[PDB]
Design a protein around this ligand. Sequence first.
Ligand SMILES: [N-]=[N+]=Nc1ccc(NCCc2cncc(CCN3C[C@H](O)[C@@H](O)[C@H](O)[C@H]3CO)n2)c([N+](=O)[O-])c1
Length: 765
Amino acid sequence: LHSEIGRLNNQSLLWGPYRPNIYFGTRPRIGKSLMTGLMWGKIESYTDFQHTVRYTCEQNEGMKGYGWDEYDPRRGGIQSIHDIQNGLDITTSFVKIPGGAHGGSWAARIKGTLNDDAPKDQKTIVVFYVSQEGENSELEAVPSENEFGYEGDVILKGRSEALGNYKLVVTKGKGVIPQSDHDLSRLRGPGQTVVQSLTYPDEVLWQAKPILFQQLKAGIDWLVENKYDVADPPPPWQVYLLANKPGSGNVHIVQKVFEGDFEFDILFSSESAGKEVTSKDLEREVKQATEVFGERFARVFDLKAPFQGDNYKKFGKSMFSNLIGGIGYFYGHSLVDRSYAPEYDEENEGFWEDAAEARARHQEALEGPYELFTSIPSRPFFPRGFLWDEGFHLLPIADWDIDLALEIIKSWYNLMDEDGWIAREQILGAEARSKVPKEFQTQYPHYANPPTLFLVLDNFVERLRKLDETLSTASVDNPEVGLEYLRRLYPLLRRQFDWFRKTQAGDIKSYDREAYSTKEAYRWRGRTVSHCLTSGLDDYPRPQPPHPGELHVDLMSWVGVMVKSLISIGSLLGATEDVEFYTKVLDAIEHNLDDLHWSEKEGCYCDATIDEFEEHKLVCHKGYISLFPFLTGLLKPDSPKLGKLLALIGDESELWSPYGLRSLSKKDEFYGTAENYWRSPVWININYLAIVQLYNIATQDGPYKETARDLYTRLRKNIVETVYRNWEETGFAWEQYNPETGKGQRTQHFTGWTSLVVKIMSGHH
Ligand SMILES: [N-]=[N+]=Nc1ccc(NCCc2cncc(CCN3C[C@H](O)[C@@H](O)[C@H](O)[C@H]3CO)n2)c([N+](=O)[O-])c1
């Protein structure tokens, strides 16, 4: 029965628009298979299309905005693109039609509407680019009846082991096609849909822009050789129309020129299913996917006061759809230093210098290949898997579709090496590497990242204890299936738990340190003078100088999150001998949090170092870090320590801004300093943790119930309204929010954990 739900999930999720790095394209969850990409650009001149053409996601003054209005990876959805440079409002509707033995069929409608400022006679070039990777696989453009190109549909017929037989149709579409009266039209035709079928070695098929431009440049060279010159030049749009040469190959370029508004369909028909997919099929399946998305949202994301209104429902749909619509499939080699150089052990003073020397050996090599199926923080700036971001992404996604969330968790845990290491940053293949400076690619096996994926596993278990609709909950509705997943995953959770304990161990025994436990103490590896990249709070102030004797209260608190999850899961599995050791590790963390990290002087938890005089010193920087034992749910609701943290959180002079909790206190000496990344701005992921914990204390018998209730109510409001106002004004989710002004700053299209705001509005944690 596990195998069945497994095979059904596989078949449901195989196809998607799983290329979030580009405006619009498709691929299945298969490393070497059939992929598609959309390109468009106005052409006003002989030189402008190279600069106007769109393919990979960016955000600049030329683009107003873009994203998913509606999305479910099982059904498809609708994306809006507002392109100022090209004068176009584009719609890409994508739909899946289940059937056959191969992951089903799918269809897309591309619609371009010139905006008010565009010339009513603008010529827009549109390209649908189709590649197929594989040794024993074929794809062929059925040639046209016409001499120079296509009056109607373009039929591609192909086959692979993975997809069996399929056909891919690009329809005639609707819109005016310009006609050239030039002598060239006797040889190129007056203007029509064209296809070039090419082959390149499989590993470069992703470089669709250079592949296209090489063909455009060969056309222009041909014009020059055959005496088409500046005395009598063809119009720009004919100069940039490829000579029709359909055939077989692993690349198929389908090119259309439109004058004014346009639309055209892409129909993917799996032979192994019923009848082929039609345009009338696409139109209906789209209408129905909208109805279903509407119905699921109103149940799953029931927005509570004061966010019940339609304005906030639109907001919620946009923030959610962009989050789950960012889901990608990633395949290829990753860059890794497997030297395990001894300098990476960071056991002497000045360890950052030694670590730099080891990195300068440049022993890192390509390894894999790996696949990953994950949501992403940002399509334009960093469209790839980030380990602790994914824990946040999956909290809303899990509500929507717990079986999808568990699929993504599983994909992340299949990356884990023999030691219990997952790389914090997953850059799989040359396409992914294209977006990342060479200096920032190398993953380090000694680099951790917060294990936020356990928070998701926690929600799963809580839900476990208490056809597309069916598949989405299959793993909570069929408890036998739920436990089998946990049984298969548990060992790797344990492996990661031990890996933290072997690789991110702090040192008690070697210093004048007393504590309830000689074991429980942690220090993030990878830290430099200014940074602790691995903690996730890049420039949050830490002990200066960095020191082998440091202890990180956030890191211990994450180990605390991990043990509590292992207790829950281990028990659901009856692994008694493990639960005992976990029950005892937790007990030791609860104590050592107080003995090593609690400041009675300051009224908050702090990190620790050892002095110039070699004694344990608390290093207190009031901010996110200070709150961690609370944010991670480790303290008793009656704890006096919780009492003092609630005071700090609610204190306007420290953390409390009209716009949410400041990453760092206004009273801290480092407030607003340096890159000021985690040194003041409001981050939605940490505010989300605060809101959830406040609500927990707020709905419990205890002394702080009423304070917790006030701070919840107000913080929920401040966080939602800040993200809303900025979305209303800019159309973007932002990476962080200015505490002085409330303005969105840093990375746009951050969906991204800023999308947690849909869960903050829906309440009932
Ligand atoms: N200090 N530092 N200075 C700055 C750092 C970044 C800045 N802007 C975005 C640049 C950028 C590009 N590629 C990847 C990433 C990682 C983003 N992010 C980092 C989170 O901290 C981490 O927790 C989190 O996992 C990851 C992923 O969401 N970021 C700026 N800026 O725009 O001025 C100053």
